[PDB]
């Protein structure tokens, strides 16, 4: 059953790498979201500094 067994193995391999691509992509999205949270924090902090400067003027 070599041929069939091999091609079933390939089909399973394609499916599993697809699961892996999806996992990688969801993880990538999660990482960009973490960077966005940091940028958001930096931006809020800079805004507070700027507001103080505007008052001090």
């Amino acid at each position: 059953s070599t041929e069939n067994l091999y091609f079933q193995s390939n089909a399973d391999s394609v499916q599993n790498h697809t699961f892996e691509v999806e996992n990688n992509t969801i993880n990538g999205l999660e990482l960009t979201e973490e960077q966005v949270h940091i940028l958001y924090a930096m931006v809020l902090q800079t805004h507070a500094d700027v507001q103080l400067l505007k008052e001090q003027q």
Partner: protein
């Protein structure tokens, strides 16, 4: 400082995303090659 820690976190995430995209693309390339066997 809080600013320095944000910077350090940002740098580490830059690196993780680079590795993650490289892995995603490598897995995609594998699945295509296998599928076209």
């Amino acid at each position: 400082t809080q600013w320095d820690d944000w910077v350090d976190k940002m740098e580490n995430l830059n690196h993780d995303i680079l590795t993650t995209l490289h892995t995603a693309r490598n897995n995609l390339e594998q699945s295509m090659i296998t599928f076209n066997t």
